[PDB]
Design a protein around this ligand. Sequence first.
Ligand SMILES: C[S@@+](CC[C@H](N)C(=O)[O-])C[C@H]1O[C@@H](n2cnc3c(N)ncnc32)[C@H](O)[C@@H]1O
Ligand SMILES: [Ca+2]
Ligand SMILES: [Ca+2]
Lengths: 171, 1016
Amino acid sequence: SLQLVKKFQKRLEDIVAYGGTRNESSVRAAFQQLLSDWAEGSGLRLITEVTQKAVAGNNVRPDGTLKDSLQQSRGYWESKDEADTLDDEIQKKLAKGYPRDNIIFEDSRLAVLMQNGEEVQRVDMGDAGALAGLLKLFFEFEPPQVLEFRKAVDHFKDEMPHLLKILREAA
Amino acid sequence: SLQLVKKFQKRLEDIVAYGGTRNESSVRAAFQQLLSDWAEGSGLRLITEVTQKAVAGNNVRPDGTLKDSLQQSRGYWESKDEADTLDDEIQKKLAKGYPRDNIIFEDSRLAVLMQNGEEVQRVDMGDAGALAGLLKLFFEFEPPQVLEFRKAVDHFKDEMPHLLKILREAADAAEQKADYRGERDHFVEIAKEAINPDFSPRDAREMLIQHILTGDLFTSVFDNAQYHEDNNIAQQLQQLAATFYKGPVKRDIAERTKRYYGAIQAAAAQIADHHEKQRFLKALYENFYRAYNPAGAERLGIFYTPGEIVRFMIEATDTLLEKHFQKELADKGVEILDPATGTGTFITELIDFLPKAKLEQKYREELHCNELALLPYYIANLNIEATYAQKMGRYEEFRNIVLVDTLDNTGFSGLFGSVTAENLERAKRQNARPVRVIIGNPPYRANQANENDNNKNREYKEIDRRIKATYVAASTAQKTKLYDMYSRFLRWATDRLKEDGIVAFVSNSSFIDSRTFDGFRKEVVKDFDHIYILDMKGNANTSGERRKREGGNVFNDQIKVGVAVYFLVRSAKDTKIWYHAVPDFWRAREKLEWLKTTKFEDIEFDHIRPDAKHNWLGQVDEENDWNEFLPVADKDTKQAKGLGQERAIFKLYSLGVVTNRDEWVYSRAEDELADKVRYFIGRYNEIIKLPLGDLMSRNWEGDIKMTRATIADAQSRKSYSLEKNSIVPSLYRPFDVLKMYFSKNLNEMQYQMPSIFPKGVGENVVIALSGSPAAKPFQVLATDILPSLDLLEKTQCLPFYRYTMNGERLNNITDYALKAFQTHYADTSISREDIFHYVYAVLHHPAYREKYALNLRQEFPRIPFYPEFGRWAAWGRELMALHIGFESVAPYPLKRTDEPPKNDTPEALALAKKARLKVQRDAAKQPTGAVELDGLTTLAGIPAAAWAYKLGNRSALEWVLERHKETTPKDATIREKFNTYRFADHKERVIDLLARVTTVSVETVRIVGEMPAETM
DNA sequence: CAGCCCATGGACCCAGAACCACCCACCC
DNA sequence: GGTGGGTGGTTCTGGGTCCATGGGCTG
DNA sequence: CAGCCCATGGACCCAGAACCACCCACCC
DNA sequence: GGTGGGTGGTTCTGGGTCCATGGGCTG
Ligand SMILES: C[S@@+](CC[C@H](N)C(=O)[O-])C[C@H]1O[C@@H](n2cnc3c(N)ncnc32)[C@H](O)[C@@H]1O
Ligand SMILES: [Ca+2]
Ligand SMILES: [Ca+2]
């Protein structure tokens, strides 16, 4: 919701004001709550710091992983410190094998979504309408499983005549 | 394999020869057919020109995709023309979106395999061996789904406790419906005559929770819902479950257990090989019992057999069937039975071994099985039925599995297996079958761990009567542990095999070298004609260098007992005992890889020739003059006051006091002990006033350690009372003088010690020694305080005096000894006290301990007549002084250094006053001469020689440190109420003892080094 | 003949430590 | 910009007990 | 009453037609 | 090395019939 994005924008201000620190560890709670509360309405849950074995045998631990009810990863998130070049730091993490299926790399001021290994959208987190749009894409990404399910439903239609032969013979 | 790659090369040359074209479209049919035929053997199939959407949305079409039965791609192949650059073409195709998960970029000349996005192997297609390797890797690549299933199986193990909570609550809410109680009462009474005479409603709720849990996963993960519908035993238990598990009750349980079943179902649905999914059956089996009934898992035995052992045991029974009975496992007439199926691993791997041509007949009337528990029965029947279905295409129900106690069904008239009627028929048919191979992993369990568990092994009258009349009768051992569940299965086997055949079992390897198994080693060579033992070591109940030599358990290091794969063949000279032991210091992996890569024929066995004491290994040398005196003999001890069979140095000998409740009877302080005993006597007195029903069924709260003796006198309503003159000092471990309550009421066996040290406090000196058969090195230590059975291994104390009933200290050194010594040395000066000190010295002599080592390990230490005598009894007067008065020897100068706590937090001090008592060692694991006592005090300056007074596998100093560490009491009551030992209160006393014992150690090492370098 | 001595070997498991990933303070 | 350190996770690795309980004795 | 007249709107499907993908032949 | 056929698959896309069957005559 835009209301959820607007509360993140306030939470972030308070963390740097009531806390005095702009360290990523302290400021990440604002987006963690945004992602967690959006997910609670979409039938998913953001589980934080879950380790995933990368393709190079190494283990990578993103700041958060969106997980379904079958404990299946549907999305990822890695926050950085605003005191860095997001673009440069995205490359370092992606070269250590950080997943590139549906990942939101996010410094406190700018958010990047890389769905299917390609940057779908880069927004500014000061704009509520823009972040809400980028988050919608991330939360509504169609994983390969649902596309394979659709493909097999289409094969079942053409293979129905042949299944009904076996069942007719039985009767 | 090689054959197919050779045909590939034969086709490639003939396509360019008979066709005169090098175009990819024509030369690709060679590799297409190589891959297609290799795939047909691996259960996959190469489909050609299958389109696939790439990430960027470009439909890419490789030259072929490897597909499984679930129509899922598990590999790809793209051939190019040889008139090109493979690396350049790979790069361009990859950039078009070509998958890199598992792809063979083929060129008529060379082929590269890019697995996981990275080149793994590039070979030349002109090599029949290199292409065979590349293709093996392509057709055995583990897809992402296989790895994500193994992750899910591991997580289900940890969530099984929580899942069984939902199911337990359900079975409890069923005990309110009278329909359930009525059916349960019918089941308990039909299972009290079929399974266990003591089947209880608690056992029935277990079988229900098993039927429910497995009747959900069989329909979800394994997709065999029909199994439960058609299984004979499942229909009897659905009749008890359909009294409650239905409608909204089932819907509620299903919605709360879906969070524990969701992940495995997701991953399992993408796996087609039953061989991969069978790891879940193995995990449900083991973990269910660990989380629900951890005690019943001990009774039944719930450990699966690593497949490597079962495959070796199947291959070897075949080599041995040919060599002795000129038959084969596949031949008609060879009926195989698995007495304890478990997960059915033995019968599933036999299905894989036997060829498809004979499998049908083998499956319908030759392979037989038995099981006692429901979850194992269900898991096995499904495993066996699905291995046949995957191999032979069609599904046939296995009708040769019975739910029966193998040892109870010895009807070769009982209602054993009368759970249902088809079960009873299967039991009677199996009894009549002519079994020739009995293969399996018998349950092993010698005794219960503590008497407070009330989990004693069941008694089997028929089988136990056979063991007493055969194995136990032939044994000369005082304690028979031949009633182990594995020796009961070994008796049953020798009896089920009525004519000729093999009994291939993997069991505890005590039979090869254990005093209790003397009678088995005598009887088994009469029943069998060829015995082939293969020791896999693994005994973790050992310590020190032995533990290191034993190595890892071939059972994935999950058990601590020694294991041996043995094959006992009876055909129709003398029995040939062949033996091969796995190398020492091997890890479990190394031991299991050997079994997978070795054939029975290649193994080099050694002909064991049993000795007259029926020992197969550890046979002593005979060229020695070991017939030299005798410290003590069972005859001298039981001599009937005639001084005619007094043929040993000492007359009476005794084992140290065993209490059976060491945590309740021994304490570092007198006050703490009196308080601990007070609680015991108090709670016992409340137990003796209970209904006879509760008394006889041991139905009391177990807050005190009740042993056989106590349980007997609590049913005899006897009343204990605190006699306060029973707290006496006692050497518990070397250089560890605790205090003990010496009462015949609270000490199980005081042995003959009420004669050595009467009333616990008495005047005597005992040369304590290790007993036989010893596992730790020979150890001898003199004491003036009551010893314990575990001061040294099976401590056998030899006293100097002997107190008669209300009598004098009759000298225990015999007159035969005195006269013999006064004769060899020819000096009547020799007195009994000189002989006492002579014996001590000889037993400390290093060369005697080395030469007669195997003798010392199996007998009472016989004493040589060393030339001098004077010098020896002198050395032994010094040794005994240091050892007995170790509390008075000069403290060696040790430098104490003290450091302050890290911070000033109250908790730092507390954490730093905790005992560490560790020998600071260097990188060569050799002592640096310092001991970190606690986080603050550190003593240093210990000489290196002081680490060599090794009493056992631990040095004297390491013994003092170990027996002063703050170790949590195993007993719960003592842990909660009587745990008041803080090293802080004993730090100064330890600083003193460590110094005194440093002197004892360096002095002993010196005296022992002055002794000669040769033994008479 | 029922107490009373005499063995004898046992179907794991869990604390140190290494080392690794990540981020924050700390130099640099 | 590493670097060490704070914190939490993830593999390995090493290393070892009191005490049940049948049988023989035995007065 | 059966035996003539008179309406009146209908729960798809499929042949081209691109247009790709791949690759042999054909120039270049 | 592009470049146009050759071959096969993979998406759109455009574009449109005779004839059931009740009710009203009708003689
Ligand atoms: C440790 S498992 C044997 C392992 C199995 N052979 C394997 O390879 O997977 C022992 C099994 O024997 C079964 N069993 C069958 N009859 C038995 C009997 N009479 N006594 C004890 N266990 C018995 C138990 O239910 C238990 O599951
Ligand atoms: Ca982060
Ligand atoms: Ca190709």
